[PDB]
Amino acid sequence: VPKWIQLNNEIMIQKDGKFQFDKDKEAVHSYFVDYINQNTVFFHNLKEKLDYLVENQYYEEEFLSLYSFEDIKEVFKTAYAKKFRFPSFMSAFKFYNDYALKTNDKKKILERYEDRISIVALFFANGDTEKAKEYVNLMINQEYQPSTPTFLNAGRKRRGELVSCFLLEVNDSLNDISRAIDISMQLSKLGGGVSLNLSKLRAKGEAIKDVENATKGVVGVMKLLDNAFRYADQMGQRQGSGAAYLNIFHRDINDFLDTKKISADEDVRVKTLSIGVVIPDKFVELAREDKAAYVFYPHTIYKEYGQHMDEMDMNEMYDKFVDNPRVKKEKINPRKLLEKLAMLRSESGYPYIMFQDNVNKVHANNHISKVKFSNLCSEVLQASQVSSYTDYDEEDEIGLDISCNLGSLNILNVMEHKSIEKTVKLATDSLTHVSETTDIRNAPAVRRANKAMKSIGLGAMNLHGYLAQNGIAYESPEARDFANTFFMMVNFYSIQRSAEIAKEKGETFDQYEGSTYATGEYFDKYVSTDFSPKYEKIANLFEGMHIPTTEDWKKLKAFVAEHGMYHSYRLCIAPTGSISYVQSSTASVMPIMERIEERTYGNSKTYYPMPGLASNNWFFYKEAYDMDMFKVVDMIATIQQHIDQGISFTLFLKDTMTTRDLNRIDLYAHHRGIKTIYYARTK
Amino acid sequence: VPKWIQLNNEIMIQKDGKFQFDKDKEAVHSYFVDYINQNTVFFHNLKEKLDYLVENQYYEEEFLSLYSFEDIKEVFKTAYAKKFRFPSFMSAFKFYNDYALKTNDKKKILERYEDRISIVALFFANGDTEKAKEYVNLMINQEYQPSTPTFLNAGRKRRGELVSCFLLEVNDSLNDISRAIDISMQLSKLGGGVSLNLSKLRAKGEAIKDVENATKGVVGVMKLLDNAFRYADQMGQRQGSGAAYLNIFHRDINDFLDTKKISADEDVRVKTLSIGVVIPDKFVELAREDKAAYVFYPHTIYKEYGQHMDEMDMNEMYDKFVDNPRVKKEKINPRKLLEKLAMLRSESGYPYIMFQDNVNKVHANNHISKVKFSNLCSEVLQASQVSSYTDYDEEDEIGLDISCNLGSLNILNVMEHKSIEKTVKLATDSLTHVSETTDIRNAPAVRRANKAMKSIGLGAMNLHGYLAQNGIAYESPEARDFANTFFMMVNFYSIQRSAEIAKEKGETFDQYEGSTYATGEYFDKYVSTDFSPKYEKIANLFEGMHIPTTEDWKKLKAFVAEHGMYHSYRLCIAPTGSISYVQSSTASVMPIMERIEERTYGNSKTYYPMPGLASNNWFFYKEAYDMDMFKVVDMIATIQQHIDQGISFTLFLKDTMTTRDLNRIDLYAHHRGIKTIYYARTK
Amino acid sequence: DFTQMFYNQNVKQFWLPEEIALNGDLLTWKYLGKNEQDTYMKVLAGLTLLDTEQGNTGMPIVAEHVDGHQRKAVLNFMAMMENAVHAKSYSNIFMTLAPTETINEVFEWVKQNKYLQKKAQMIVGLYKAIQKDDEISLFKAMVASVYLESFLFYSGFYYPLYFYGQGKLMQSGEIINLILRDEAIHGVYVGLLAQEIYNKQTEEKKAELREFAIDLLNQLYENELEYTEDLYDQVGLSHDVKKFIRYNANKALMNLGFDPYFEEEDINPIVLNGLKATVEPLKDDDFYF
Amino acid sequence: DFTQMFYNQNVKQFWLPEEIALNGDLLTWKYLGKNEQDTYMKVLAGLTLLDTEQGNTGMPIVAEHVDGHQRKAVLNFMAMMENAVHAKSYSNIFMTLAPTETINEVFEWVKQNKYLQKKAQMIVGLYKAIQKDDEISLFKAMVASVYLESFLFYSGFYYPLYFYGQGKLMQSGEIINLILRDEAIHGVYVGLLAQEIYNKQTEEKKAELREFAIDLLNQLYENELEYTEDLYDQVGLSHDVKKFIRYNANKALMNLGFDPYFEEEDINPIVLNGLKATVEPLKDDDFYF
């Protein structure tokens, strides 16, 4: 066993009844003085390194050609001047195993952390040396972390796409289904997770040109998509991951759910395609009143009204659907469907739950389209227009397929540096650059939506780490007050940066004029309610930083009205799974699953303590499963009120609790304004 | 139990030690006195019937509008003047259960046999009343039978395409694979059987964008195609049928074959995807000499030579591939592979066997392309060019995808009417009309090849029926003499009609000038070898009909040289599954499987004796399983020497014979010039 | 002289209830009177109980005490058929025709029915009385087993056969005929083993064994009469069934090498109407013609 | 939670010796050396002898003491496969490859062999020690049974799989693969029955049962190493066979719900080629907060 492995395992060997957390630090030293420094490839100077990486097809030469070598040297020197040290063994291990650039045979390390950060910063700046240094300082301080696609692939010749998630709308036609399968394979080839809205597809037993009971429903398309994602599995490196979203009022909703039952037959079971359910407020109202609900056949509704079932408001059209004899429907028990959802989430963690009305009551771009589904991580909530892929030799009507670039603020590092504004603006600029340089030649709706919406996702990580390292319980009202203030600041500065980009470029996102940003409605709660901290401890935490007031929000509203906004969507809180290790941060705004996690790598086992875990903050690092899910819902709703897109909200459940407890948590989330629920992980 | 079913089951009841075959005739009468006439919709006049069928979206207005009502009435009167009577119960049952037009509620019969024949004739003639009457006389004499798609769908508004055999070339790309899946779905939606060539696809463990061990091979593509064919199942009417062809020198050939093993796992086995193997002469030579063979990685060959492995002659390329270090290959035992093929055919009848050099040594259009694969029934053998389907908003390079037009001569009815020439020419004209009226807007290469090649398949059936009713054993040399003469006359008149159509329209098929028809090579064996019958009995059978001599063939060769040939391909012998029942004929040129076949429809049993079966010809109606497969191979080769495309050749084996016997039959078929082997049906 | 042929016959008769689709009986079942359905359910439940004990106890225990690996293989196979095939088939029939509550009720009814409990007590008691290396206790249990196989099942078999013969409940009836075909060979086989033991005895001992067999038969018979009346009076068939069980009692005695005990009677004619491929390598001469 | 599922998997795996033609093995058998033929014969006899104990005692004794009609049926089916299918299959392989006199001598040798006897008698000893209504003694016997099904057979299976993976003795190798596939499911099933007993015990009793299982495994493993060298040194395979024993020991432990004992090792590639949360209804007022 390696020396650093033994040093890391020495953490759990208690001394005087206490964990040896400091041993972890020793491990990193070993991991660098025995493996990383020996396995790294050193050159005489930076010129030889850059030339070797360029000619050997490791780096794209275009982004490096925008800078003179003196500027690149200055950027690299700025990166190395911080003398960044990984405080935990797992941070360095995760970076050098998942994100550091290696040779073709993967026998040596070509990229250090500073090298990777410098390359990403130079790609972000697009020829601006000062901007590149700003990005270097932002990432080496670990205030901002680009998503895994962006951080791993920026400036690389053998790179994939920098966009993490893609959302596709599938129209009710064989041509559209085949095009959706093709685009899903193309985007999984690019490495991104693909989500498909199957609510427009007509249910099982519908007519294909006057011959009835002909359609296979959404389950056949689900099987096709599952095989497509199995085939396109990132060249066999990462399993192809897809998501299917169906409205709960679709007739196939049961069969949909039956794809995830552990007793499902092979002709129905789907195993590589995640499932999500979109629940309008009408379904929750029907379940609450115990009135029997009706699921609908989409094609009959489309024939009668000319629009898809998910294209209009169910809260106002459900009674018209039920009373219409030309609309076909089936009777269901909404409470039984809710119990089935809870049982399925207990068994397998599926489906994702999207509260459609919670998303669309604060959605700023309802004029473009209502949000009808979410992404594979159930945090992207954007307007999408379905595409009409016609026959060959016929022009296709290209719609809008959602796609946003992810980037997370490290809350602990951002607040320690007292740089919410600067970090938010620089992250917005980096995400705007990632969107601008993204061009996908096989997904036309994705390309058009990227060019028009200009949507980005600016997330946050290390919420629980910051709260526990500052002596604040994650479930406490003080923690929710901190989240309210911090994310109001993040939203304020993201809107300010979006408006500044719109002013400097003279262009807004497409159809911005009909948005609530243009009409000023979006700023209502910000121009009437003060989001400054209500607790003295939180206010002290925010000292040295100008917390925006109602007057600052009014000025920002006027600025947006004058100049517009460059981005249709700005903030989305992704799960941030593996890149949180490198940043020494807790995953996303979720509470920690465990204080010390035991992970098996190779034939060895490693223990990763939570960042900053110690004796004095052991009980502030409360495990998520031990927490009240209602207070976690309160925290997520408090954050969500300042996030325009959704938050990947994983439910952390105990084995003792029943499906009724899961249903109660889901209904409280819906009541509190939670937009989406990601996972039901049971301990 | 209905009266006609009792009268049909009375056949097996033996009187005086003989089957009551004549009772079947009585059954037909009952089937018409009790059921057909009662459930047949009658109209006051044909005008009312045509108006009702057109208005209720049963027929098409376009083809009926080309004639005055007097001409349509005259065509119907010509059809009804024959007073055609089905000789067996199963003929009428199959027609009125499969082909007769029924109401939307499927309880009444709108079309009789004469009505359907008249409608198909009017569709064929395209406005010529005399030509329509000629077609009516052809089909009511049952000399020619349009295929199930053409016969069932001609003149019907609610219909699939008139072509059901489609051959697709799949290029080695994700875009091409997705396009192939889409086209397969679209053609299965039209009701056609789709065959895909997977030899150009790179094997498992190949590089994608210079990353190693990334390709899933052809088995993942087969899984995708199997899912696509399961999804597209004729609006839930018939099981989606598809075929995949792989060259035996493709490295995936074992895994390909492993998709049909019973022991194969769920992630390996494809259930609704037929498989065929293309066997070049090089593989047979390697197996014969017991030299170990090599299966090659197609992408390495493409990178080294710039052409696909299946696009070049393996006979001259195999040694260069083996000696090339940059071509990756795996060692195999060709005799072990042959034994595996025989074992798989014994277990499941798969794969289909295509002898590439047997096809291509007589292929007339090798300049366009060599025949690389066959159809789902393993009888279509045509030149195909792969298409380069690029990314979106980029122009695709459309190639040639095979789609031939099926139609079968009834050898008994044709020869008893002494009308080989007239029937062949009229069938060629009808096939040309159906090929010209076919327009598929979702298969670009299929449409392009249909417009360019103008390839049709004119088959024959009732060969064994005709031979048995004339006191000729199917395995006798006299039967082979008759087949030689009859199919040489069929080829002569098909070529004459093709040249006449080319002269009339002033156009040949695309790239005809490079064909062996243009150079006169095709006629070589016809201008030197006399194909007149060598037996007096066969000559007396051909009495009253002019048998083309060598001088006639020289005149035809000169005529083709002067005027060209309209069809790239003219003759292919399809299995003729259900139309053989309606025509009261034995299926294809195959020998009969059973003298009397027992079938179960609903909860009732039915008995179909072979047409013309009696005590006198009971011995001549020898069952296929009791026959020597070498003599069946000899007869099929005798026919194949006059057929430009292949013949659906099913092997009929006993359970006693082993895989050595199957391999011997396959090798004798290869030796005798058999182009394709369809199935290995074990009794 | 016989085990090998019984081995071959038993294994070639192998079947599973799932081979027979039962949804075809749905309508002829729906059409029966409540009395008829009640008797039918109870009859099959009585059969299920007998096969449960024959599979769990009777056949395995006889297998344990009979010498010879081939004899044991036959008896083990027969045991498997009893509980893995026969007893289970009845549940397939129940699950098709009846709602869960009716199924629950009939299984509760077997537990409390005094005739069914008495016959189980008597038969299983004899199985559990077998003593190692004691051929007489083994003979007594084999007589009990023959009486179960060839006599006791028949008060139950009557009714499915009676319907089958009228063209009613024919899928369930097909299952029952397969079960009956098995029990007939099981009764013969166990009968032959019993005769082996009987033939080893003195004339005095034989006389006692015949007394045992006849006393046991009469005791079982008297109980079966009451069981038959209890089940069949409501469908009007008790006298007919009684004739059938006497007929089969004689067959059981004959399987044991004894003379018939009951006089011959005419049985309902309806019930009488109710009755990889081999691989060779390729030679170099197979490539030339 | 599991018996009906195992019932299904067991009955759908049903097969008979006659299905595989054995005579074509003589075409590769004749080309093996004396040591290869000797090892094969000895291994085959070892498997035969152990499997007979499982058919005559192991499965029937467990079926006797386990409560539950459906479990008894599955166990009966497994006992049937041992006695009616597996035993006939081993006999068929022997009769094909060796003359009668050679078979008798090999069985005489293996019957006297110290390492084969040690393991055979250790297993049989635990079956004989089961006491009525004592679940601890039943558990110990189940552990022994799982060790036989999932571990002890594999020092033997190695050789036929080794040939099968090379294209030698393919017909008998196919038979062995079918047998092995049955023993795998037998081991998993009996393992689940043992875990059921284990989970009903106190923490101290559990620790005591774990110690029993590990101690037994150790005794059997040390004898397997000796058995292995005794048979496989003459054909140079013992090192690789030992890896295969440990890998299968780990599977046996996992069947009993225990952690693997041995470090993970790769296996010979030729042999490889041969080879609910509680539902609680919503009570209303759960929609209001």
Ligand SMILES: Nc1ncnc2c1ncn2[C@@H]1O[C@H](COP(=O)(O)OP(=O)(O)OP(=O)(O)O)[C@@H](O)[C@H]1O
């Ligand atoms: N935790 C760590 N994170 C990142 N790099 C590290 C870490 N520990 C060691 N290294 C790398 O290994 C080298 C070993 O030097 P070390 O940290 O022991 O101190 P040093 O030799 O006094 O110099 P310096 O600390 O100034 O780099 C470091 O210079 C650095 O490049």
Ligand SMILES: Nc1ncnc2c1ncn2[C@@H]1O[C@H](COP(=O)(O)OP(=O)(O)OP(=O)(O)O)[C@@H](O)[C@H]1O
């Ligand atoms: N074998 C048969 N094949 C086809 N149609 C039949 C057959 N037998 C009877 N029919 C139909 O039933 C009708 C009655 O025929 P039948 O044998 O009674 O005498 P017919 O002289 O042909 O009668 P019709 O006056 O109808 O022409 C036929 O006209 C035809 O429509």
Ligand SMILES: Cc1cn([C@H]2C[C@H](O)[C@@H](COP(=O)(O)OP(=O)(O)OP(=O)(O)O)O2)c(=O)[nH]c1=O
């Ligand atoms: C062709 C086909 C379609 N479908 C379903 C899936 C699609 O969502 C739906 C629409 O198919 P379409 O491609 O729209 O078929 P169509 O346009 O010819 O019929 P229509 O005019 O009624 O739109 O039909 C199947 O389930 N199986 C099939 O094989």
Ligand SMILES: [Mg+2]
């Ligand atoms: Mg449509």
Ligand SMILES: [Mg+2]
């Ligand atoms: Mg390519």
Ligand SMILES: [Mn+2]
């Ligand atoms: Mn029984």
Ligand SMILES: [Mn+2]
């Ligand atoms: Mn029995």
Ligand SMILES: [Mn+2]
């Ligand atoms: Mn066994």
Ligand SMILES: [Mn+2]
């Ligand atoms: Mn076993």
